[PDB]
Each structure stands twice: as C-alpha cells, then as structure tokens.
C-alpha cells in the first residue's frame, strides 16, 4: 500500500509560481490561478486576482509496509538436493547430496 502524502500547499500571495521538477515517487505538481483562500480569520491575501496556488502531491511507503509487503522475484534453473538414509549389512549412513 502506498501512502499518498500531500505537502502543505503554498500560495504566492500576489505574484506567480512555477512547477519545479522534483524526483519523488509519482511526483505531481500543478499551479492554479487566483484562489483567495481562508484558514480561520476570513482572509489570507490582499489580491483578489493574481493569487496563484501550488498543489503538490506524491506517494511514499505506508508505515505498516515493513510487515505488509510483497516481494517480486525471478527464478532460474533449480538444483535438487536430497537427504538420504542408506543401510548396507550392519552399517547405516545419513548423507546430504546434490
């Protein structure tokens, strides 16, 4: 399971922003025009227009993947090993061989 982590958005309060090129997993960044956002006090900026916002998101491994994860493998020619018990007359013998 991937944890879709979303960094806190930033707003260039009365200017402009440009999407950078990070190297996170499934990194996705977009820029939107004037938004005029509210937090708790009825205003965050002073320009009704040209108030761009930067929406950023990517993915990481969930905290519980250390147990809940699947490992992918490729197999090749397999060698067969045998544990063998053999008795002749009085003597018995155990041996592991390829």
């Amino acid at each position: 399971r991937f944890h879709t982590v979303i960094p806190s958005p930033q707003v260039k309060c009365c200017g402009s922003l440009e999407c950078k090129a990070s190297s996170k997993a499934d990194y996705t960044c977009r820029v939107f025009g004037g938004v005029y956002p509210f937090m708790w006090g009825g205003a965050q900026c002073f320009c009704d227009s040209e108030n761009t916002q930067l929406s950023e998101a990517y993915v990481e491994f969930a905290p519980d993947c250390t147990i809940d994860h699947a490992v992918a493998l490729k197999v090749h020619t397999a060698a067969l090993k045998v544990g063998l018990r053999i008795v002749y007359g009085n003597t018995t013998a155990h041996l592991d061989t390829f």
Binding site: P7, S8, Q10, C14, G41, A43, F46, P63, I67
Partner: protein, 304 residues
C-alpha cells in the same frame, strides 16, 4: 496542536476543527485501528508528559493552547469504541464494523466531532471465520498493533508553521486600516495599497493609503510551534525538514488462536472419497492431486 479542515463536523457541513482525522490505518489482524489527528494527547500546555489530559488549539483570535481530559474523548464508527492507547498525534482503538470513523470532544454541551469515511470491516486470521478468538483452537502466526505507546511503526515529518492571517487583528474605521496586536506579542504585518510594504508592529498602529480591510494582513511571529505536513495548512517559505515524530503502536507479530472445524466424515468408494462436512461458519476446503496435474480446488463451505 494545529487545526484541520474536517469534512464533516458535528452539524454537517465541513468546518475547521482541532481534531481533524488525517490518516486511518487498520492493518492489524485483531481489528484495532490506528488513527492520526491534529491534536496532541498525553501532554499539557507545556508539553509535559501526563496520561490524564491532552491539549489542542483554542477557538479564538489568540488561538492559544487549551487543555482537556481523557474522559471527554469519544471514538465511534457504528457504536462506541474502546480506547486502547494514545500518544502524540496518534490514537489506537478497537472499533466495531462501520463505514466511517468519528472522534469527538465533549466539553459540556460543546460536542465537537470530526468524522471521516473509512470502510472498517471485521477481519480474521486463518481459514475459518469467527466473531471472537475461540477459547480452544490452533495457535497460528498473526500480526497485531502493539499496545505499547513508546513503539515505532515509522515516522512522520513536521515543519515550521506558516503564516495564518487574521481579520480580528485588522480594524476598519473612517475608511482607514489599523492593526491591533494582542498585548505583549509582536505581530508581523504586510499590506499592498499601491507599493508592497512589510513590517513588524507591537501596538495599535495606523496605516496610510489603505481604504479596504481586505488589502492588508497580520500574524504573530509564531516560531515556537511545529506542525505536521498536513494538506490543510499554508506552508512557510522555508519548508525544509525540521522534525520527525515517531509513529507509535508498531505492528508486531505474535500468536493468535483460531478455531478448529468439526472433523470430516470420510466415506470411501472405488477410486474416490466423499467428505461429509459440517461448519457453522464459512470454512475453507482445499484439495489437490499429487500427480502431474494438481487439479487444485478451493471452496468456502457453510452449513452441512
């Protein structure tokens, strides 16, 4: 101890609450779920460790840190949940089946509750369905969240808080704008009524050239806090990694008891068998040949 933008508050519509649920995890096989919220638990105003009480941000223009007790916390999905543990941003609780999870603080008549959709199903470990761990049965390997609060399932990154503007700090009078910082607190203000102008003020301060309240903003230089990298906050200019909290309640392995079904009744016949089976709950039956072709067959069987 920030506040999120909860989609479902007490009444109905989305609103800003101190107890927004950010993430919910239910990977444990015993049904216990780990929840992450903005509020800080196990701590008082100064952050000192104490199991009796938790902290949160106040609903006012000063937004100082207020406090409450454990007995006023309620967790519920379809019925009331049992609180198993609490540490920092995180809770761990065993809950019944439900489609959403709700966490609420009952400050007298103020029942501030945040609900988030999460399909919490009743899961089991093994090959036999049951409601409770049976008293008698096989002991199999399972993985359950550790109830110890000092464990570590990973980490969460936090950063310095960003600007959080207020209109109460601003005043309109005679078509002129004023800034009224709270007493004894320095407030950084910034405005644009023509030329862009920043600054810091600490008293009742006039500004010139401004006619509308919307054109300026002010906030106190609150560098004395840390906030999780939540999508409901405006980030600081320097959003560098400045902290890492642990994720308590690691998912540890252990031994779980699972039931043993009624022994089948085998009736033999020429090149074949007939298993009479009785299982009050769905029990898995898996058969396979030991030749070139497995001819594997799997079936969940109920009744007789």
């Amino acid at each position: 101890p920030y506040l999120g933008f909860c989609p479902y508050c007490r009444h109905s519509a989305p609103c800003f609450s101190p107890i927004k649920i950010e993430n919910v995890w239910d990977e444990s096989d015993d049904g216990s779920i780990r929840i992450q919220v903005s509020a800080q638990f196990g701590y008082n105003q100064a952050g000192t460790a104490d199991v009796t009480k938790f902290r949160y941000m106040s609903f006012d223009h000063d937004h100082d840190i207020k406090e409450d007790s454990m007995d006023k916390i309620a967790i519920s999905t379809s019925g009331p949940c049992r609180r198993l543990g609490h540490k920092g941003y995180f809770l761990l609780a065993q809950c019944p089946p439900g489609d959403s999870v709700t966490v609420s603080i009952t400050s007298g008549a103020s029942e501030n509750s945040c609900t988030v959709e999460k399909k919490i199903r009743r899961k089991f470990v093994g090959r036999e369905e049951y409601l409770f761990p049976p008293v008698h049965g096989k002991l199999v390997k399972c993985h359950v969240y550790d109830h110890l609060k000092e464990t570590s399932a990973g980490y969460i990154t936090m950063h310095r808080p960003g600007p959080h503007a207020y209109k109460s700090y601003l005043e309109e009078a005679s078509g002129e704008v004023y800034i009224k910082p709270p007493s004894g607190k320095n407030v950084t203000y910034e405005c644009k009524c023509g030329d862009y102008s920043t600054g810091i003020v600490s008293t009742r301060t006039k500004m010139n050239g401004c006619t509308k309240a919307k054109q300026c903003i002010a906030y106190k230089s609150d560098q004395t806090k840390w906030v999780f990298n939540s999508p409901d906050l405006i980030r600081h200019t320097d959003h560098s990694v400045q902290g890492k909290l642990h994720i308590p309640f690691r998912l540890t392995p252990t031994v779980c008891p699972v039931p043993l079904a009624h022994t089948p009744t085998v009736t033999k016949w020429f090149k074949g068998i007939t298993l009479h089976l009785t299982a009050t709950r769905p029990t898995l039956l898996t058969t396979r040949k030991l030749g070139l072709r497995a001819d594997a067959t799997a079936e969940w069987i109920t009744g007789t």
